[PDB]
C-alpha cells in the first residue's frame, strides 16, 4: 500500500509542506516540512526514498532559484541535503532510469536551460549529460522503455507543444511528433504504454484537455478532459490510475485531486488537498 507524496508548491508564497494521500482509505498525512519552501520543484522516488529537486522560493520579500536536491526517508520522517545541481533550476522536469535521477531544464532568472544533468545516489553526484534540442521551462517529463521524454514547456519566447526523447545509452536527443495543443505547466506521466499530458496553459487559456502519445503510432490522441481546468498541477500514477493535484486555473488555487480511470476513459474527484496550491513535486512510494 504505497502513498502519493506532495512536496512544496505555492499559495500566497512558496510553501514547504509535505503531505501524502492514501488512495485506498482517503486519508492525508501531515509529514515533515521541507528545509526551505519551494514551488516549481519536481518529485521522484529512488529505492523507497523521495527526492525534491529544483524550484524557486517565491517569498513576499523576493525570490531565490533553487539548485538544491533533498531527500526524504519515509522511515525517519526526515529530509537530508544531497549535492546541489550545477545550476539553479526552477520549473524543472524530472524522470528516473536505473535509479538515476534526471534533472531536465528549468529556469535561472532569465536563463532558460536546455542542459540536462544526472544524479547518482550511490555516490551523491551530478553529471552533465547532453543538452536537449530546445530550452525548456515548465516541462513535463516521462520515462518510457528506458527512454526519457521531454514534453511541452516554454523556451524563453514561446510556449511549446514540441516534445523530445533522450537515449541514455547513446547520450543523444530526438524530436518526436508535436502535441495537438501547446502546453506550459502541464502534468506529464506514463500510464500503460503511453505518455499523457494533462492541462497546462496554452498562451491564452488554462486547459482541461488530456492527450496521450503512442510510441509506435507516433500520434497524439485526446482522451476525456478533466473536470477542472488547471495549470502547474502535480501528476502521478498509482495502480493503473492518473492522479492530478491542484494547480492554478486562471482564477484560484485548486485543492482538488482528480483521478483518471483508463479502462473507462472517465475522470472523477477523489479528494481535496488540505489547502489549494500549484507547482508541487509529486511521487509515489
Amino acid at each position: 500500500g504505497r502513498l502519493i507524496y506532495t512536496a512544496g508548491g505555492y499559495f500566497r508564497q512558496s510553501l514547504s509542506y509535505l503531505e501524502a494521500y492514501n488512495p485506498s482509505n482517503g486519508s492525508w498525512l501531515r509529514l515533515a516540512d521541507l528545509q526551505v519552501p519551494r514551488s516549481g520543484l519536481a518529485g521522484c522516488v529512488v529505492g523507497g526514498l523521495l527526492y525534491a529537486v529544483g524550484g524557486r522560493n517565491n517569498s513576499p520579500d523576493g525570490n531565490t532559484d533553487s539548485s538544491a536536491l533533498d531527500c526524504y526517508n519515509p522511515m525517519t520522517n526526515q529530509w537530508s541535503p544531497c549535492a546541489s545541481m550545477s545550476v539553479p533550476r526552477n520549473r524543472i522536469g524530472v524522470g528516473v532510469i536505473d535509479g538515476h535521477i534526471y534533472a531536465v531544464g528549468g529556469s535561472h532568472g532569465c536563463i532558460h536551460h536546455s542542459s540536462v544533468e544526472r544524479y547518482e545516489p550511490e555516490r551523491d553526484e551530478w553529471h552533465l549529460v547532453a543538452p536537449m534540442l530546445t530550452r525548456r521551462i515548465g516541462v513535463g517529463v516521462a520515462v518510457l522503455n528506458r527512454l526519457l521524454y521531454a514534453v511541452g514547456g516554454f523556451d524563453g519566447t514561446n510556449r511549446l507543444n514540441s516534445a523530445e526523447c533522450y537515449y541514455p545509452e547513446r547520450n543523444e536527443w530526438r524530436m518526436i511528433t508535436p502535441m495537438n495543443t501547446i502546453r506550459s505547466g502541464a502534468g506529464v506521466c506514463v500510464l500503460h504504454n503511453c505518455i499523457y499530458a494533462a492541462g497546462g496553459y496554452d498562451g491564452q487559456d488554462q486547459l482541461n484537455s488530456v492527450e496521450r502519445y503512442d510510441v509506435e503510432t507516433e500520434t497524439w490522441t485526446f482522451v476525456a478532459p478533466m473536470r477542472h481546468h488547471r495549470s502547474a498541477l502535480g501528476i502521478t500514477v498509482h495502480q493503473g490510475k492518473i492522479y492530478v493535484l491542484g494547480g492554478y486555473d486562471g482564477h484560484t488555487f485548486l485543492d482538488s485531486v482528480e483521478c483518471y480511470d483508463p479502462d473507462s476513459d472517465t475522470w472523477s474527484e477523489v479528494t481535496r488537498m488540505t489547502s489549494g496550491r500549484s507547482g508541487v513535486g509529486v511521487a509515489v512510494t
Binding site: Y10, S39, G40, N58, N63, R91, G138, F154, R159, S184, G185, G200, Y201, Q206, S231, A232, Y248, G250, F253, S278, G279
Partner: peptide
Amino acid sequence: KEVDPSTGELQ
C-alpha cells in the same frame, strides 16, 4: 497584482 498565468505566481 500581476500573476504568471501558467502558475498563478506573483510578479
